[PDB]
């Protein structure tokens, strides 16, 4: 096991433009606090519109025809991404420590989940750089028609606080492998791993201006990015409300292309013929992983009437044994909730459950008067019209609903405006394939949960997003198609 | 040559929902007028939000799982599209006459160009129905991972007045070949061919509610479609200003996926080593086709200094010989402009050209003071700062600019916020390929103009659009990617 | 139901070259007999090496650059294949009658199976003609690299007697959609449907020489095709022994490319959790369809010990109720075996079963002293080392083997040098996917049998073949890849 | 520049099976000699059929389901290939010195050309391992149809003496990225780099038996591989005559799939409008690279009459200045020929050129009567009927032919039974594209020569080969297509 770094000193706190470190134009700074201790970690430069303008101009200059970045052969862009993945692997303990300091997630989770995802995503997209191919199209005997899959240009990336470095790498890996340049804005709550990655980008050998990073607030830096007349594309991960604002500002300004990865109201469907212990364990991790603060969280667990009581009973036994505490401690599986606004949000919904007719089975309150920890809560007798089944709790609350037929559970699972993920538990071939085809979700897991791969696309149907991240499909978000049609005389 | 139908009676004027004809909920109607005779053709039902709600509900019912449309095997949707193409071919003369009546374009142009494009586009996408394939993705030894390219659902289509049936078919062909259902809104100026197509959809055997058509105005029907919470996707062709409104309404409502095909400020670059006579004929047709009312029209004809004077001279001869008149006459190459608003706007730009210093070579005024005809106009000595070089004229005006170097003409050609098409005329291999690569345009034509194929994608860079129409690329706009990941026990 | 044509007169009996009908150069003819009556149907021209040379020269002239066939736009080749499918549909009753006359298969089977497959294959490949796309490959900043998927040239097609027209269309549809020209050789036992198709090829409008047909014997016409120095590719369907000879002669002569579709020793695997009645019915059709004379025939039915006796019992009940008789009679599900050599081959293997320890359950002898009919036979207690489990019977004999575990049945099912098809029956998701991944077969059917689609590839692993027919994969057999690499100065 | 290793000791001389070194079963050894010093380098174990049987059994065991190699996740096979490339880069100087010792090619050519190709090819295919994707195919509403691109199994590789390590890596890289196991046979003249690669395969961490190497002769080891009943695929690079033998042995044994990369009679077409100095330099390197012992060598340099005399003149100056000598010297551009047999064959062709009427411009004899060096030879006034224009010389001889029209040079260039490569030199767009389309060659270079990329396929038309190496196309040669069709109840 890797050794925890409980007293790490943050070295990168400035704006990264043209492979150099800058103070904010205004001189302003903001603090980042550790969610576990509530103490301040350091001050970071606070970017605003003038810093975004400087970053966008550097990105435009690095993308211009004839630039060192544009002149690189396709395989050399792949080599640079592999060199960046080598550095991320070398500095893995430090990156995971900065992520634990900023988010409060357990060190071993940051090391084995977040950082593993970063390295695998970088290596996967490094291999696509010389494999981005257009088409030769047959038309007429005297015509040569073909398509070029060109880089779009300057790409803005806006990410959230729950998986800071990972959500940034899901955009940076395909963007760079396609030949674009970038302006990144990490969440104000979690700027540290992004700034450290800036140092590795320069060390890997990327030409100045290919990646620029401006820390700051959403309505200031984020809005300057979404409305910028010289940013050609934006990729956003975060809340549905902010995703709508970003896509609106992008449309209002220069019609820049927009990828959105938003929340969900993700269902779990457990059939009577499932391996019940597998379904209980997967639905447990689905609800309680990352303190419930994950876009993939299960918000509705639909269980067939035949196994309903036994599923509730075994779920209650699993929720009580979860170790909660200090993130840097090896035994810890659940750290604190990011902030007071999140901790109070989760606490307010549990009361509505008991008042609407649902039976509280376990938990239902905060852990202790010291940190932002909440007790794993399970609810039975949940119905569709209830608040705990209609709203994204983003906390450790497991609502268990009952169903009788496949057709009925398909209608209920799809009765939401969201569609990010779904998980089905059954040993039956026909039920598994029928549910996988019928569920309106970007990813359908069968007999598993949270099984992500750099090679498999991920994203939402309906209001859970626009576009896909990961897989070959991610490349379509970072390229522009040009048709060249030549008529021979 | 097909005989001109100079006195056709219009049979289809109503709202088309569930394969039936309906009066508008308000009882209101709007007139459609022939721009050549300036007489009213007929009155069409004027839809509003209640009519759109009824059409979306029909499209939703036709799309629900288990419906006749959803149960059709892939090859059967292709058969339906070929049966529609056969009906469009059978009624080709009537559709072309309806298009000439509504738009003023010559009857032989609507017959051999617009209608040929419709038939070719329907047959091309009919062949894609059983060829839309997802992927099987290698992951781990105990995992089966694959993607499904599912239909998105209810698709809205909003089209302009310059190529009414064709812009509609460009959306309808891929949408239906992917298994979607639709709500169509033709332009208020040109509703006739869309309504006639509705009668062909019912005769072709499409189940009720697969295609619904609501004629009406933009801020009423169009805005009800763009903001609808049960429309999953919208494809829009029209002005950049309205495209922005549609995309903002889409983001604000339900994050429906959006395709935009907007205007351009398209450059046509004529090098000194070009086949000069081919470049003159192509740039002439490229400016003057469809009365200059084409999104592909050359807004800037850049000619190298070495051939500038002879290019201008030969272009004037072409412009002076272009037969302008009654669109139903066999000799007519140019009919009237669409309406008074467009006619006055073109005349305003012609006066601005004179007042800013451009040399008027020919035309420069209306034909015979009464009709909506404008004399084919050529301006030489045009510079980049002039209005006739910056603004999309959408009329029969050819502005000829001079250039000296390839690097300079690339900079000038790309200095626009648009990027729909570009054309290059040169006999040199290196010049042609360097220009094809450097021009920021969705289609680059070399030694040809307006060379479109159902199999070659078309769309804009920058503010000329998002997404592509035609080719295999059109399918990505009408399908939603689903990852199914199965872990074997 | 379509009316049978019990007294049809054959009109096409000559060699088809350059869209004209020719006598053989030698003047020789051969007879074709009806397998049901044993009577002679007609005499057909007997081609030899001089007729093949004439056919190959016509095919070469039709394929030369600048020819009408080579000049056709991609979409027009698709239109020709659709016109040929329209004619095949129009003349469906006549084609099915000629196939029943030549093969002895029931008229309704020829009409609803063979002819349906022909029409679907033609329509599917008609849609690929304008969708055969190569790639644009990223290399260096100063290089333009792309691939062309060109037609190979003159394609020879050699087919067998069991599905005459269908096996020919599986080659002709992709070959023509890719732009090649052809020399066809149907089996000497079944020349009629191929010659009738020649008349429809000319009527559809294919230029002369694009398709040429030379009836005759294998060692004469077939060998002249496989060894021809001006045939660029051959596709062969038939016995493994003849497939090896064709591939050897192709290699010895000019290294022409070869696709082979050969026999199999196809397994059926029925798990204890299968829908037993579905498994019994599918394995019945698998063994007894087309009198057992099908490349997809099940030669080994592996049944899990838990359902073994019940599977044998229900299989015996199904085999006794099969209606055998006159092919043109509506109630007939089984006609006669093609010839005496086939009828005697099936009769000799049943004796070996009883002598090696297998229990005969039903049948085991000829039907009656009048025609070439054999009684549906079922064997239980079959082992791997027995002759009825090791040899392709090509007749109505169902050997039922017993198994205990999945790992064991995978090893046994794969212990053959063949690998054409396999079928698995189970309600369990994991067993279905594990068996589908582990079985070394070109097609794995799950809970079905003989489910072919024009869009799904078909072909063998190991000695069951080389290459694939059907699906997008068929196009790779009929195209040659050319890389064009251009360096810009 | 890397320092030349003039006195390297060879460590690896044994048969490599299961990551261990073995003496031959017979105890026999064969010598390898340095063509520059004409002294023996070392003795290598001489394999025969017993050694091949042991290597195939190891490859089969390494390929069986459940083996460590088969259980590796897709991304892990890519990591192994990158680790092998890192080891080839680390030992680049030693591999290049071993290649120079065995072949006589200049040390800097083996270092910057052969070894660079090896590393680039390994890294390109390492990136394909997690990107080999099959398809999900739409069929019927109740059917799930998909393809898997499975590894073929045991692959044999037989390579020639002119680019020993590179031709091996071209097969090894895609074979292992697809999950296959291998038996390799390097040429008897050049076994050293293949055996050194074996030590790198074991050090890289490949499980035992994934790669096995059996040095030896063609009719013994090579024929045992081509005829082996447990080898599923063979890739061969070498002469057309031996390729025919291998393909016939493959057909006669088990129908193993075959790839052939054979010789060519490659045309190099220089138009009057070419950049003459570029065409002279390219055609010079294209004939003389690797002592003229390249499959890509121009066998016919066709020059348009307008520039014929000046082309000949400038080519003579290049040929006279080419430094011939000790391959380890930095200035050397041409080493000795491979052996006495090749050396005498080249001298025989040079005499035949003189006796048939070609004008000897320079060279025409051995360098200094003792060594295997031949003076760079240029012949003008060459005609199509001459031996030096029909036969693959495989030596430093440039035959320059004259042409007058494009149509005539297309006919003459395509009149061969071969079709590996072609090169065209012209500044005209139409001429370049018309020639690229009309030349029957697997690779057509325009204004360049020997421009190979790991991402661009390479292979022959006609008798120059079957299949492609490099690019995405290489994967189709190392995978077997499986259709899985599931019918839902
Ligand atoms: N893969 C995914 O779909 C995915 C992954 C992680 C998180 N999320 C979602 O993230 C949400 C919570 O994250 P959060 O609280 O950081 O969300 P948030 O939407 O408030 O902020 C996300 C980012 O947007 C910026 N931002 C805020 N207002 C802005 C504005 N007006 N214009 C531009 N940028 C602005 C923020 O500074 C931050 O960088 C959850 O709903 C969760 O489902 C989704
Ligand atoms: N899809 C498939 O894989 C498929 C389909 C149908 C039939 N088959 C196989 O067909 C076999 C029986 O068919 P058949 O009896 O017609 O087989 P066959 O191999 O004897 O003859 C097939 C064809 O090859 C020709 N031929 C024979 N000898 C030749 C030679 N020396 N050179 C060239 N051509 C020659 C014949 O005239 C005929 O046209 C079975 O084993 C069955 O599995 C396979």
Residue numbers in the entry:
A (entry chain B), B (entry chain A), C (entry chain B), D (entry chain A): 20 to 508
Which statements did the authors publish about this structure?
The human aldehyde dehydrogenase (ALDH) superfamily comprises 19 enzyme isoforms catalyzing the NAD(P)-dependent irreversible oxidation of aldehydes to their corresponding carboxylic acids. Cytosolic ALDH1A enzymes, and specifically the ALDH1A3 isoform, are good markers of cancer stem cells and have been implicated in carcinogenesis, chemoresistance and relapse. As previously observed in other members of the enzyme superfamily, each ALDH1A3 subunit is composed of three structural domains: a catalytic domain, a cofactor-binding domain and an oligomerization domain. At the intersection of the substrate- and cofactor-binding pockets sits a strictly conserved cysteine residue (Cys302, ALDH2 numbering), which is essential for catalysis, acting as the active-site nucleophile.
Each monomer of the ALDH1A3-NAD+ complex at 1.89-Å resolution contains one NAD+ molecule positioned in each of the cofactor-binding pockets. As expected, the NAD+ molecule in both subunits is accommodated showing its extended conformation (suitable for hydride transfer) and interacting directly with residues Thr178, Trp180, Lys204, Glu207, Ser258, and Glu411 through hydrogen bonds, and to other 20 residues via hydrophobic interactions (left). The adenosine ribose is held in position by hydrogen bonds between the 2′ and 3′ hydroxyl oxygen atoms and Lys204. Thr178, forming a hydrogen bond with the 3’ hydroxyl oxygen through its backbone oxygen, is unique to ALDH1A3 in comparison to other ALDH1A and ALDH2 enzymes, which have an Ile residue at this position for this purpose. Only Glu411 makes two hydrogen bonds to the 2′ and 3′ hydroxyl oxygen atoms of the nicotinamide ribose. The extended conformation of NAD+ allows hydride transfer between the substrate and the C4 atom of the nicotinamide ring of the cofactor, a necessary step in the catalytic mechanism which would not be possible with the NAD+ molecule in contracted form. The highest B-factor and lower occupancy values in the NAD+ molecule are detected in the nicotinamide moiety in both subunits A and B, whereas the adenosine moiety displays the best ordered part of the whole molecule. The ALDH1A3-NAD+ complex contains a PEG molecule (PEG1) close to the Cys314 residue in the substrate-binding pocket, with 6 and 4 oxygen atoms in monomers A and B, respectively. Also, in the substrate-binding pocket there is a small PEG molecule (PEG2) in the same place in all subunits. None of the two PEG1 molecules were covalently bound to the Cys314 residues, as it can be deduced from the distances between the Cys314-Sγ and the PEG1 atoms and also from the electron density shown in Fig. 5b. Next to Cys314 there is a water molecule that, as it will be shown later, will play an important role in the position of the PEG1 molecule in the ALDH1A3-ATP complex.
